[PDB]
Amino acid sequence: RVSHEQFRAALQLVVDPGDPRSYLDNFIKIGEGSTGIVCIATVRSSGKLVAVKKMDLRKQQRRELLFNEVVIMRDYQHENVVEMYNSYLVGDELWVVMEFLEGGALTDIVTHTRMNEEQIAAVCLAVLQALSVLHAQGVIHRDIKSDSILLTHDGRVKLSDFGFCAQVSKEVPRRKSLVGTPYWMAPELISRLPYGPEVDIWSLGIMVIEMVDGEPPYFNEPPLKAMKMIRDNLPPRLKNLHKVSPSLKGFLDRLLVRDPAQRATAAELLKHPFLAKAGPPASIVPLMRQNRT
Ligand SMILES: Nc1ncnc2c1ncn2[C@@H]1O[C@H](COP(=O)(O)OP(=O)(O)NP(=O)(O)O)[C@@H](O)[C@H]1O
């Protein structure tokens, strides 16, 4: 196909040259996503662990989204953003050599235990710091959920899964494509309206419900029929606010605003009294798999 070859060659120029198997050993699969698989590997000399995401060009939904997988991590070096070391083209696959995140995904934690507000705030602060930098450059993540948040062994929190990113500017102020996971999708986005970075703030709102209630709303419903409910009904509320402090409550009320214009921005939210509750990375360590019995 003229389509495949042209895209292959383009991507070739974007990525670093060569094959990482000239310095890496012990490729073992450690999980898979929608784009492709992720495996750990070892640096020959160092003996250090890294993570490698492998993505087949021929097996993509929208092939051009693969540029994000390289560019976003390269251009947004940040405390709360996964470090990318290199990107290579191996045959018909894109390989991204990035830091291995020992602590796993946030999903593992929310599905099993209940976090306290100290720990919830610490996650939100990390994500909002990451998003403020992205939104500042008109970059929307479009896939905010617990699965996109990875942890270190020492309890630091980093954002991942940039494959669905899009960029708005003064020329193109809004996106209109339908991307992201059904339950974390903003109402204006589901309605197929022109949308901006405000859709990420909503998704974060759904991720707070995840951290409090353990599920995004309507999670037990089929994906299609759940989207209709998000599109039709009022902003979802927490099950019971008896034990939720008004700090969190008032914070979540700024996230899950139906009108995008009234919804808060990452810049604004970074100053919300609630985020001052955020504990040290050490307060997150108890929540991780290894430290549970
Ligand atoms: N750097 C990393 N260190 C450790 N585990 C990782 C790392 N990156 C991804 N994973 C795990 O690998 C699994 C699947 O990879 P993932 O990057 O989620 O694919 P994906 O769903 O296609 N993301 P995207 O399509 O780019 O939004 C996830 O459940 C992660 O927990």
Ligand SMILES: [Mg+2]
């Ligand atoms: Mg995934």
